[PDB]
Amino acid sequence: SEEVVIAGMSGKLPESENLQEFWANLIGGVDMVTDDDRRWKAGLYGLPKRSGKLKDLSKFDASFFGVHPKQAHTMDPQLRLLLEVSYEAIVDGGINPASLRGTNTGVWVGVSGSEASEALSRDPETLLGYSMVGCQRAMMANRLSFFFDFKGPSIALDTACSSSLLALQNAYQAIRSGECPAALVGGINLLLKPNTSVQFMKLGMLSPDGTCRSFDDSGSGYCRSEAVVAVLLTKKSLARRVYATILNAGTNTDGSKEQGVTFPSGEVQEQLICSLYQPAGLAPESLEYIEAHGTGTKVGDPQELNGITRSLCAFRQAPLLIGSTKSNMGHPEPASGLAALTKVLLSLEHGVWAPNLHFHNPNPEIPALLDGRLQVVDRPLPVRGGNVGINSFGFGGSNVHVILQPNTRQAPAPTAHAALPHLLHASGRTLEAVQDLLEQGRQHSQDLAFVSMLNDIAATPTAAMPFRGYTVLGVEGRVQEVQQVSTNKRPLWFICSGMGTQWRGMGLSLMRLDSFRESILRSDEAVKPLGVKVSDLLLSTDERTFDDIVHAFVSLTAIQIALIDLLTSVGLKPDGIIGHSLGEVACGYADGCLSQREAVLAAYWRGQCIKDAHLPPGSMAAVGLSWEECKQRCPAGVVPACHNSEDTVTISGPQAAVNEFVEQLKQEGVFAKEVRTGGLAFHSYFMEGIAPTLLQALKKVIREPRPRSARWLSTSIPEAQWQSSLARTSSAEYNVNNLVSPVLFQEALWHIPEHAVVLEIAPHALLQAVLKRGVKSSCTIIPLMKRDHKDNLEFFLTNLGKVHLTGINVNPNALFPPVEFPAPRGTPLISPHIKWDHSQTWDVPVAEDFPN
Amino acid sequence: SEEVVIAGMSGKLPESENLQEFWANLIGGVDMVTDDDRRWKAGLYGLPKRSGKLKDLSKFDASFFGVHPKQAHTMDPQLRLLLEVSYEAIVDGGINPASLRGTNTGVWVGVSGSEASEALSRDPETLLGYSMVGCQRAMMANRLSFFFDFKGPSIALDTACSSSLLALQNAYQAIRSGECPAALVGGINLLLKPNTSVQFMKLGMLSPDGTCRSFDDSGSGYCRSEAVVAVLLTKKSLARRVYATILNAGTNTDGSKEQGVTFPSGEVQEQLICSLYQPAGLAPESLEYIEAHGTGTKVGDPQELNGITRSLCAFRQAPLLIGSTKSNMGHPEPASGLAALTKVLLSLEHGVWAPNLHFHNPNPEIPALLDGRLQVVDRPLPVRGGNVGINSFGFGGSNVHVILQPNTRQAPAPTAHAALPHLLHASGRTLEAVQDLLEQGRQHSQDLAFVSMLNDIAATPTAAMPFRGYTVLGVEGRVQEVQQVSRPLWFICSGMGTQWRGMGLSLMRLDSFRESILRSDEAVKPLGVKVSDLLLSTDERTFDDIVHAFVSLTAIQIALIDLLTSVGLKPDGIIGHSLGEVACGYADGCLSQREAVLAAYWRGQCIKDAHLPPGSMAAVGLSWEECKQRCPAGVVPACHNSEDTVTISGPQAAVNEFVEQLKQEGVFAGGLAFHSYFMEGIAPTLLQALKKVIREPRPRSARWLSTSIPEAQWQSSLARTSSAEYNVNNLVSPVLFQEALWHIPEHAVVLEIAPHALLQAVLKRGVKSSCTIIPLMKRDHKDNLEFFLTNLGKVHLTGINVNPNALFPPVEFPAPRGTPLISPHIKWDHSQTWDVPVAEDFPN
């Protein structure tokens, strides 16, 4: 008792480079069996000219999989292709492979041949030991387990034609029982060695026409085909996409039979099917369609379909639809079951059954074809609803049957939170890969499940996926950016900005996000008793509301908090924090020293204690000279107040010297403008008359001071006394000290390391210009809001995408209400849009590499 | 929740044609790795000269397995050997494979190579399609499922070196969960293609010295070896033998590793082990011994043993014994786990751990070897008791661990009545096969569990096993007979003249016989007599009384029929001589035991009450026809025994004097004259008593041929049932015996059911020479239990199955530990010689 779902799929089939191409051929009625000379001179040794073949075996993004070129040239192309296809299958489910690393996830691979092994070991003189590691059959599973870090069972298995569906069944049992949370299941077959086809020809199993005429009177054997298919199974609770739910599955074996080991026993096949329906409480009446093995042999077709008649049709009012993918693409031997499973799920996802080919006259030995109890799908029929069965029977008697319940979940009805703009990330091996995924997102921008899944798979280690991109969906522009990434560790720095960042109706754009709004309404609970509401202050576009120092300090800090809350919701944890002036309050919230209440109220009283105080009329001007040069050329009573950069220093004093010894600068052509402080001289001795009343209110607010982490660098206290006990905590004392001490900003920026990402946390990104000058060129400086930007939600999103571009992972899904998985039916496939770096070309065995 | 046991095993190992030879080499410290040119010129391509190799690959009893010679020459020798070894493994468990036919028994085979496939498909012109059916890897399992008719899962699997122990673990899970009642589990590896060794050499996995120096500082890689091993798993309730109980088992995979895919992760191996002990309520303290993978590589040995140290030694007071079969015989790759499992179970069964070879200086990177937390078994150590662990780790990271609880029934399995002599059957492909099994029985004659198991496996269809044999155990003789077989079964119930003093006192030792006699007592206790008292009495005239004789003969004839039935013998034809026709009715299903015993009573009591004149009978040597003429008056032909022998009946007033007019011319020759006129005065009073006894007459089957009623009136309504009327008619009518024997077909087996086999001489003359006539008791034979047994063996010799185990109290399985192995004594017809791929069949 644990629910098992088919979550993701991918594959390569005859004439079909991915499952989109496979579908196109299926529903299009294209015969994928061909007669060219791809593997060997068609007709050689009197073999059928027709076989189902893959378009290509020579491509493999070796460096992504950690495989050096010498090892790649000696890998079974089965395995090279299965690595890609496996990755494609996992992400198709909307699951980041990283989230399964180290889990007890299993791998089962159905595989019957190792022809590359034979070829690559033919010459003792020149063969490589690596050939074993890349060709021994166990490695078809073990190398997958090695790459993905799956620590559950890792098993290669052969039951001939039933191998891959057996593999599925084994995986299903492992998940059901609780052994495994998930399973990668594979099926592979290649036609490299002609001698192999000769063996089957001499047994009389191959049709001369190279065609599986499933169910037709003129069936005379099967068509050999290739396939590489992979499917991700998970338990229901882990799944995002859900193609179908596995209701039951089992295997039996024909046993002893008078007629020989390769004569299939319809009677035992019947026993298997019977044992999985009524005994498990599942009615044959619930089936809509059964995918038969259907190899088109004189003997097997009647054994199978008659067994189906006795086990299923006999317990039914309605005709049972029946098909076989082998009619479309031939028989890929152990991969038959997964190949067929692919057709079934593709059919279900598009709402229409892909038809059989080659069905002209029913086999007269099969009563149910003649009386309509079985109805062959020879035209595209719509999917009316119901369960689906699948048979795979190996030529040594090993039988498998699985029962699927299709996922029929419909999409939600759209709501107001769906209409907001959304952010979409991608990563990739090539810029094409990223563009292709972003394009696919633009096109299905309203499918919210699809966008969630694509964001989840975008958070990938940067050495693996060196191109990244983002797009903002649901906005007038075409907002998109894509670039190559530095393999560097990129550390994350929060910068909380000070005064001068206020504006009319700031953050009203971001109240559409629930996490932002809830942070503002929580900031309201702190300052309601004191007669003010931050939401009312934001809403008010009375244009002088933020001239009041209390209105500004409280609103800036409450927003800085809401942004921090967003950044956190999205998974951004800072490596360093730095505050400028009033920013040191928000910094405390970011660091874990201050609760939201403590920070908002520290902002209130910091402003209210200035409002109530008689300080002498003072003013500040930024001036164009160094910190050191400001010591000398200042008069008395004017002091260096903010060390912004080595060019820009704010000074503070009374007008009694500030205006007149600003002109002794600006007559010598030096930069210098007054700043709108609301009439005060901050970060100077002049504020020291606030200390007693502020220190009292803040001791009633910051109950028990908590330590400041190493991550938080003070700008109030110079580096030499970071060890001091004033510095140790964010106390009432630290805060008061900030307000009277200078702002030692460039001093903290000297400590930001190479290749860092720096986020300016503030309702307008005032300090961008300073940060660029003040921190290393190798760093990337990112704003988060602009003043009077038409849409700040868009601006925030675009910049949050810019963080994804650096290499740092970001989950924008958390900004919006959670999507209810399982995803609805018909959510677009992801596997076909996964693009690899296929610039290299690897060796492939040829017919001449085998004996003759 | 379902208990899983290892029930049976067999195999072929380097230098070891069966597990007896393997054990001999193990405990004897023989290095089974060799350097001859068996597979390829030793040294070729710079390969090690040493590899572990099987003695032979060319033998396969093809016709037993239904394989035509063209298919056999193109079978992977892996599969040919695994078919034999699998059969050997199933019967080693004391299980007749027939009893698993049609069950949902599973097959899992660990296998990594199909070098025969490459060889046999090298030439398109001349290759056979059969090569696929005999070499594709799925067939290593599917052909087993096909031969044994196992309808559970049939899976061939590859995880490289861990494949066979993985296979065991998969089978274990299937039985545990209820999917399968039993599982055949296999492991196979051959060294046919040199190129394969070259690949391993270039990876740096093979030691140049061709030696697995498990745990030793001088380890430099592994020795490639061959093996073909098979083990039968069952749920506890099906098992006869129980080597061990699987307490837990699991697999994990190393996953990602900086050092590469073939660097083993001790840390992940440790995680596997940890997950199977404390979490399942099993203490590392309970382990006695751990069978390490132990391939003797610079890297792997420390990873493994250190992982063992952290997961197990750390939770222990005592040192943990450790070994590796690879030191003894090299590394047989996917078959490593089952090969090692074999050593462990053999050690447990002989009470001593086979030591490692090649262990001289501990690897210094393995702290626990230096501080004694791990103790390598480098000398034979006694088995002190405790659980056993087994590691098998494949070179691609796939790890398996199993925990075993050895069977601790040391004492024999409880039963009644062990001191009695016992009967042992065997069947075989050759006379050697039969002799070998019988010899093994003589030698362990007191091991009752062993004898039960060997009898169970002896019931095999005669076309499959054309030689048969038996031996009687626990008797002064050397009673043993063996022959080839090409047969319908006839019961003959005999009449009067078979009585004797203390008859059937020998057979009262058998519970089924005694219970039949005590049930015959319940019928005639109300009438004042006890059959058991009459038998016990060796007052030597007790059976002169007609009631005492009739009741005792018939009660015994019934007890014998009961024995024959308990043993599985159902008759194809039945024939009675005179009073025998009562017993015949019981055998046919017409008469209950009560009805038959009481019909015997009143038949005798009604004659006793009529008080008749002295009459007598003599068998004479002249035909039925000749008896009409040369008889006087008052003497008549009474019993047509053969065309030479006819019994006559009359008064002595002519019988003695007109017997001498014969026996002066050299002619062959309870006081009454039966089957004549003299008895016709009993008809009314007997017919009345028998109508009170046979309530509702039941029909006589076609199988029962009348001797009272001639063939022309078998259709009659007197003949239709065993009525009061049929019985009375028998007593007055002649006995048309030769007339019924004419109907016994060619090649029939004929059992004379009677307390003395009086009619043997007649039956030989009277039925075809092609038939086999068997007695069951003799008069005053020293031991009739012995005599019965010997003759019951003679029936097994004919081709007809017989389960003598039912004659004795049931053996309580599981069998005790140390019950001898059966697998090594199964011998095949290896007169043929099949092709084997050679080095020259592969590219160079």
From Swiss-Prot, chain B:
Location of N6-acetyllysine modifications: K59, K70, K298, K525, K782
Transmembrane segments: none
Residues engaged in binding an acyl-CoA: D644, T645, F668, R765
Post-translational modification: In adipocytes, S-nitrosylation of Fatty acid synthase occurs under physiological conditions and gradually increases during adipogenesis.
GO molecular function list: (3R)-hydroxyacyl-[acyl-carrier-protein] dehydratase activity; 3-oxoacyl-[acyl-carrier-protein] reductase (NADPH) activity; 3-oxoacyl-[acyl-carrier-protein] synthase activity; [acyl-carrier-protein] S-acetyltransferase activity; [acyl-carrier-protein] S-malonyltransferase activity; enoyl-[acyl-carrier-protein] reductase (NADPH) activity; fatty acid synthase activity; fatty acyl-[ACP] hydrolase activity
GO biological process: acetyl-CoA metabolic process; cellular response to interleukin-4; epithelial cell development; establishment of endothelial intestinal barrier; ether lipid biosynthetic process; fatty acid biosynthetic process; inflammatory response; lipid biosynthetic process
Keywords, sorted A to Z: Acetylation, Cytoplasm, Fatty acid biosynthesis, Fatty acid metabolism, Hydrolase, Isopeptide bond, Lipid biosynthesis, Lipid metabolism, Lyase, Multifunctional enzyme, NAD, NADP, Oxidoreductase, Phosphopantetheine, Phosphoprotein, Pyridoxal phosphate, S-nitrosylation, Transferase, Ubl conjugation
Domain Ketosynthase family 3 (KS3): from-to ranges: 2-406
Residue ranges of the region described as Acyl and malonyl transferases: 429-809
GO terms for cellular component: cytosol; glycogen granule; Golgi apparatus; melanosome; mitochondrion; plasma membrane
Induction behaviour: Up-regulated by endocannabinoid anandamide/AEA.
Positions of post-translational Phosphoserine modification: S63, S207, S717
Record: active site: C161 (for beta-ketoacyl synthase activity), H293 (for beta-ketoacyl synthase activity), H331 (for beta-ketoacyl synthase activity), S578 (for malonyltransferase activity)
Compartments, record wording: Cytoplasm; Melanosome
Quaternary structure and interacting proteins, as annotated: Homodimer which is arranged in a head to tail fashion. Interacts with CEACAM1; this interaction is insulin and phosphorylation-dependent; reduces fatty-acid synthase activity.
Function in brief: Fatty acid synthetase is a multifunctional enzyme that catalyzes the de novo biosynthesis of long-chain saturated fatty acids starting from acetyl-CoA and malonyl-CoA in the presence of NADPH. This multifunctional protein contains 7 catalytic activities and a site for the binding of the prosthetic group 4'-phosphopantetheine of the acyl carrier protein ([ACP]) domain.
Protein name per its UniProtKB record: Fatty acid synthase
